[PDB]
């Protein structure tokens, strides 16, 4: 019985931080739903890669709960997540049910916006540290991937594979992660 | 054709052409700062006595394929140093 | 005056090997056209990421020539490239005009199919070595990225960033590549 | 040329996943050879139904090529297929000649064992998903029948008719499949 | 002490209507005896699947009585059952001892031939209705599976699973049937 | 109550990219403050047109907030904006309060200098693309006017009217923009 | 020896019709004198842009003659030019010496006021046609730019670039105009 992941895809999302986790997680046997924040419409990403979501967040939410909620980054992407009442509701409820929340690059800033996982050790893109640390509601980490309980964060496009494999490990265990990793030809 | 104005017209386009090169240069190595006054777990003082001693992997392996292309300048020069030899029938 | 890249996107393409180069190249100021092999229709990739091309290859070809032609991998993706007469024409002509051809993972196998760059040092995914070396028309390399003249090859999803940055370096020079690399937080 | 099918029958094969496709395909006017993996000997199936093959795989192979190679499931059956060098050779060659390969239930796991059709969208028995997805060499599907190019997969005894009719449709076209289906009294 | 089933296997029997009930019943923990109508010899079925019976009907009869007697269909198969005095004796005695008799497709026509269960609500293959209704000794039913007392009938290859599971339910109860059904991946 | 615009006027500013937006915006009923970067002193522009600011930036800032902050271009003008700590503060705060920022020609390069609106789709003068794309902190656009959320950019003197009218549309709506446009005798 | 242009700047002048020609002409290598009609004092324009003239008209006149005399528009600006005896003198003398006179928008109305270039084909702002055509001393034109001998007219802010480039062409030739125009990014 498969684990399930919700990836929330907003306009201006970093497409590498979206696609790498979706792909990697699918390789791990996770049932991934790519949910369009503002509906089923194709989503223009930060570098104009246009991705068609599997459904609207509206509809995806109804098929929940998910074993992980994944927030890709991108400055605008993260801003869009940060402004969404629907996202707030989903994260609050995920935190409540003791489900995993994973955010990369600027993605973690949406956690701050929705008052998620305060007190957690977190990392972000270097550029996003300022925003994330506004209010001192987290302790900051320089690790490529950071996991503090059910709050999993990572730094940027260049940490996307590590982030994704950390999610696999969290959901499916080390052995599965190792299996999936092998053919990726990581360094 | 005129001895060097062949390369003094072709050079004018390492000036039309290679213009868009250091133009980037200036255009782009001026904001080190940006992430500067920021802190990144990519430099911790083994990415210095390591994170420096491995950017050999990509810079190392230019010159397998520039085996020829910094040596194909040791192709085309000393055949003007035989438009030196046939010329000291004349020059001197 | 921008350098220009054509990325040929076929059904079954590895989406990470597609998206990473497009994104990275766009960060470098390259004008990238994502061209759908069989038209303008959305393209279902190897792990069901659905990418909307900028145009059909038909139409993209008319706006050429390009400074690089990029072949993503994926088993089916590469098979589809390998079977296309249009792709053959494009690669032959690119090789002819002394333009760069870059192929990743299974992607290089399309080079073999269309008799492109025979005698070149190449790498591929380890899995694709057998197919690539059928006939001994290349010398094989274990390097993460291989560049032999105007034939640039790479190994897999895990080498995608390196592949993309090698293309940037080839088109735009070392300094640009380094600039683009910096915020990616690569290891 | 009637179309021709090779059904590879190993000890421990699920007899329903063997017999249903053979029968249904024969109803479609396909010339079916039931080939015993280890010879002409009667084959004891998973539930002790004993089936006499038409010939050894050795001999059947010599009368090829076949328009489809069919792998029945059963855990032990599939293990036996997975361990056979002869099967590996047949599948490699079938993939090569652009012939159909069809596998049901645990059957698809033999594809994994012999490195067949990597990158393909596949389904399996729910129980066999874990094994099939080991290494992330496929994308997994929940559809009762899955066809991705020349890789056709299905889920279990209860999908056998659908699997078989999908093969008929692939070989003989929609109209023939519909004809064959009608008197089967399916739901 | 296991429940026991006799499956009478005649030349020209529909092999799917034979194998599905044998398999399914064995999954239910029923002791199934596949009895060859004319001995222990391998039996050529309607679509040339060749099945080795467990024993002759002669010998199987001696090990009786059985909790169910199962008649597979197939036009010739059913004709062969219809002509057998041994079959008549077995059905008469089973009806007498208030044991279950189950017949699928053309199978029920043997009931008519041996004057078994007259007055019963029955179904058959649509094609066999006319023959079955000859004399008006039954009332006809369009249900996929029909059970009227100890006379259980069904329609065709496509109803074989339902027929078999109805037998399981009759012998072993609903809970067992549900257990057996689960891994069959029925729709 | 009027909408309000701050136009920051630095030495070496392109006078046409200053005057056109000020004029056009004033025609739209926007209250425009032309603020001298280094005080109330007359400002020598790129082509020696000398413009007297309405006040110092110091004083103008005190009368904020503004519905838009406008950065004219000119190479030196933009350099001067890029070097001002006061400008940095103003842009940071404007981005923060979800106010519009509009920059033309070289003007957008000041956005880069002060780390404003990273991840935004932007245009610039062709000449300024290199500088703007330094670090890949934006996606580049060839449109005459580009608006991505609260980041509005344009290309040069020849796009000034379009730029200005886009600001009018953003502040005052389509109908007002159309009214203002009509008597401009644009093609 | 550079060509020379006199731009007469009056209170209420349209600042876009002033600045665009001054800037564009300076880009063409023309020595432009911005002469304040009422002295050296800063001039408040139609939309409150305040421009400091290079000198008084008095002083500019002493450095004449000029290759072109340019009359910006603006309704009050043009009224002011129309009422000036000094302007009359300058235009009469320019017409006399067979020098170019260029007027934009309402600007041409000053030609009428001072009885300049009667019989010429002219354009004006649509709004100013009535005033200009009072007496039928011109033939009216709908062209964006009109040149009839040494009388060059244009229509409005939206034609300012075309007007200015027409002056450049008249003074400096086609090649110079093309050079100047290219980087203006006109439509």
Task: Report the C-alpha gap between F125 and F22 in whole angstroms.
Answer: 20
Identity of the residue in D20, D47, D157 whose CB atom sits nearest the CB atom of E185: D157
E164 by Cβ neighbours in 10 Å (0-12 / 13-18 / 19+) ranks as: buried
Q: Name the minimum distance, in Å, from the CA of C100 to any CA of chain A.
A: 22
Identity of the residue in F118, F120, F139 whose CB atom sits nearest the CB atom of A127: F118
Q: Is the dihedral of CA F132, F133, F138, F139 positive or negative?
A: positive
3-state per-residue secondary structure call for B26-87: HHHCCCCHHHHCCCCCCCCCCCCCCCCCCCCHHHHCCCCCCCCCCCCCCCCCCCCCCCCCCC
Structure-block tokens of residue G78 = 């043009």
Strands G4-9 and G31-36: parallel
Domain boundaries, chain G: 1-187
One DSSP character per residue, chain F reads ---EEEEEE-TT--HHHHHHHHHHHHHTT-EEEEEETT-SS-EE-TTS-EE--SEEHHHHHHT---SEEEE---HHHHHHHHH-HHHHHHHHHHHHTT-EEEEETTTHHHHHHTT-STT-EE---GGGHHHHTTTS-SEE--SSEEEETTEEEE-SGGGHHHHHHHHHHHHH-HHHHHHHHGGG---
One DSSP character per residue, chain D reads ---EEEEEE-TT--HHHHHHHHHHHHHTT-EEEEEETT-SS-EE-TTS-EEE-SEEHHHHHHT---SEEEE---HHHHHHHHH-HHHHHHHHHHHHTT-EEEEETTTHHHHHHTT-STT-EE---GGGHHHHTTTS-SEE--SSEEEETTEEEE-SGGGHHHHHHHHHHHHH-HHHHHHHHGGG---
First to last CA, chain E: 32
First to last CA, chain F: 32
Query: Is A101:A110 a contact under the CB 8 Å cutoff?
Result: no
F134 in contact with chain B, both atoms CB, cutoff 8 A: yes
Do the Cβ atoms of C127 and D115 come within 8 Å?
A: yes
- Angle, CA E51 vertex, CA E45 and CA E56 arms, to 5°: 105
Identity of the residue in G52, G155, G183 whose CB atom sits nearest the CB atom of F185: G155
Do the Cβ atoms of C75 and D115 come within 8 Å?
A: no
Chains with ≥3 CB–CB distances under 8 Å to E:
D
First to last CA, chain B: 24
Do the Cβ atoms of B30 and F134 come within 8 Å?
A: yes
Chains with ≥3 CB–CB distances under 8 Å to A:
B, C, D, F
Preceding amide of A64 cis, omega within 30: no
A127 in contact with chain B, both atoms CB, cutoff 8 A: yes
F98 by Cβ neighbours in 10 Å (0-12 / 13-18 / 19+) ranks as: exposed
Task: Report the C-alpha gap between A141 and A129 in whole angstroms.
Answer: 10
- Cα–Cα distances in angstroms (integers) from residue D134 to residues A180, D152, E173, in the given order: 7, 19, 38
Torsions phi, psi for A5 (to 5 deg):
-130, 135
Closest chain G CA to residue F27: G47
Q: Around E57, how many Cα atoms within 13 Å sit in the side-chain half-sphere?
A: 20
Q: Name the minimum distance, in Å, from the CA of D71 to any CA of chain E.
A: 17
C148 in contact with chain B, both atoms CB, cutoff 8 A: yes
- Cα–Cα distances in angstroms (integers) from residue B55 to residues B49, C92, G6, in the given order: 11, 35, 62
Task: Report the C-alpha gap between E182 and E172 in whole angstroms.
Answer: 16
B70 by Cβ neighbours in 10 Å (0-12 / 13-18 / 19+) ranks as: exposed
Do the Cβ atoms of G157 and F161 come within 8 Å?
A: yes
Query: Is F66:F6 a contact under the CB 8 Å cutoff?
Result: yes
Task: Report the C-alpha gap between B59 and B54 in whole angstroms.
Answer: 9
Q: Is the dihedral of CA B29, B35, B38, B39 positive or negative?
A: negative
Do the Cβ atoms of B23 and F134 come within 8 Å?
A: no
Is A137 marked active-site? no
Q: Which residues of B are annotated as a binding site for Cu cation?
A: 2, 50
3-state secondary structure of G47: coil
Contacts of E97 by beta carbon, 8 Å cutoff, 6+ apart: E65
Task: Report the C-alpha gap between C7 and C19 in whole angstroms.
Answer: 10
Return the residue in C75, C105, C134 with the most chain D beta carbons within 10 A, the one to mutate for interface testing.
C75
Q: Around F55, how many Cα atoms within 13 Å sit in the side-chain half-sphere?
A: 11
Reported structure resolution in angstroms: 4.6
Q: Name the minimum distance, in Å, from the CA of C79 to any CA of chain D.
A: 11
- CATH class of the domain defined by C1-187: alpha beta
Q: Name the minimum distance, in Å, from the CA of F63 to any CA of chain C.
A: 37
Contacts of D145 by beta carbon, 8 Å cutoff, 6+ apart: D123, D152, D153, D154, D155, D159, D162, D163, D166
Chain C residues whose C-beta sits inside 8 Å of any chain A C-beta: 14-16, 19-20, 22-23, 26-27, 34, 42, 46-52, 54, 125-127, 144, 155-159, 161, 183-187
Q: Name the minimum distance, in Å, from the CA of D43 to any CA of chain C.
A: 35
Closest CA to A110 of A132, A140, A139, A137: A132
Q: For residue B53, how many other CB atoms are within 10 A of its CB? A: 10
Query: Is D163:D102 a contact under the CB 8 Å cutoff?
Result: yes
C48 in contact with chain B, both atoms CB, cutoff 8 A: no
Q: Which residues pair with C9 in a beta bridge?
A: C36
| H or E segment and range at residue A89 | helix A85-96
Contact list in B for residue A126 (CB cut-off 8 A) is 35, 38-40
Contacts of F36 by beta carbon, 8 Å cutoff, 6+ apart: F9, F43, F53, F55, F56, F57
Q: Is the dihedral of CA C95, C97, C98, C104 positive or negative?
A: negative
Contact list in F for residue G156 (CB cut-off 8 A) is 183-185
Task: Report the C-alpha gap between E14 and E103 in whole angstroms.
Answer: 12
Structure-block tokens of residue D67 = 């328009």
First to last CA, chain D: 32
Structure-block tokens of residue E168 = 């399981």
Chains with ≥3 CB–CB distances under 8 Å to G:
F
Task: Report the C-alpha gap between B75 and B61 in whole angstroms.
Answer: 22
Do the Cβ atoms of F49 and G183 come within 8 Å?
A: no
In the PDB record, what is the listed experimental method? Answer: X-ray
Helix, strand, coil percentages, rounded to 5, for chain E: 45, 20, 35
Are chains E and C in contact at 3+ CB pairs closer than 8 Å? Answer: no
First to last CA, chain C: 32
Buried-state track G37-59, b at ≥16 Cβ within 10 A, e below 16? bbeeeebbbbbebbbbbbbbbee
Residue written as tokens 């012939």? Answer: D99
Is F105 marked active-site? yes
Q: Could you say which residues from 39 to 68 on chain B have a Cβ atom under 8 Å away from some Cβ of chain F?
A: none
- Cα–Cα distances in angstroms (integers) from residue G7 to residues C116, G72, G162, in the given order: 64, 8, 17
Task: Report the C-alpha gap between D140 and E34 in whole angstroms.
Answer: 38
A40 in contact with chain B, both atoms CB, cutoff 8 A: no
Closest CA to F141 of F127, F159, F156, F153: F153
3-state secondary structure of C36: strand
Do the Cβ atoms of A76 and F120 come within 8 Å?
A: yes
Structure-block tokens of residue F50 = 């000398």
């Amino acid at each position: 019985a498969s684990k399930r992941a919700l990836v929330i895809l907003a306009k201006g999302a970093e497409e590498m931080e979206t696609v790498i986790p979706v792909d990697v997680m699918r390789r791990a046997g996770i049932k991934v739903t790519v949910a369009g924040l503002a509906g089923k419409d194709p989503v223009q990403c930060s570098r104009d890669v246009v991705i068609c979501p599997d459904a609207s967040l509206e509809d995806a939410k109804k098929e929940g709960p998910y074993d992980v909620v994944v927030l890709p980054g991108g400055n605008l992407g993260a801003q869009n997540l940060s402004e969404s009442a629907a996202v707030k509701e989903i994260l609050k409820e995920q935190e409540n049910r003791k489900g995993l929340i994973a955010a990369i690059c600027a993605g973690p800033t949406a956690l701050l916006a929705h008052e998620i996982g305060f007190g957690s050790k977190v990392t972000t893109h270097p550029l996003a540290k300022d925003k994330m640390m506004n209010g001192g509601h987290y302790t900051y980490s320089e690790n490529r991937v950071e996991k503090d309980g059910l709050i999993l964060t990572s730094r940027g496009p260049g940490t996307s594979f590590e982030f994704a494999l950390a999610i696999v490990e969290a959901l499916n265990g080390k052995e599965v992660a190792a299996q999936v990793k092998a053919p990726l030809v990581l360094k | 054709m005129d001895v060097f104005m062949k390369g003094l017209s072709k050079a004018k386009e390492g000036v039309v052409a290679a213009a868009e090169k250091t133009k980037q240069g200036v255009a782009e190595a001026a904001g080190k700062t940006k992430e500067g006054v920021l802190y990144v777990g990519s430099k911790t003082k083994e990415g210095v006595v390591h994170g420096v001693a491995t950017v050999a992997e990509k810079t190392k392996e230019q010159v397998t394929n520039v085996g020829g292309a910094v040596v194909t300048g040791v192709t085309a020069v000393a055949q003007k140093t035989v438009e030196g030899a046939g010329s000291i029938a004349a020059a001197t």
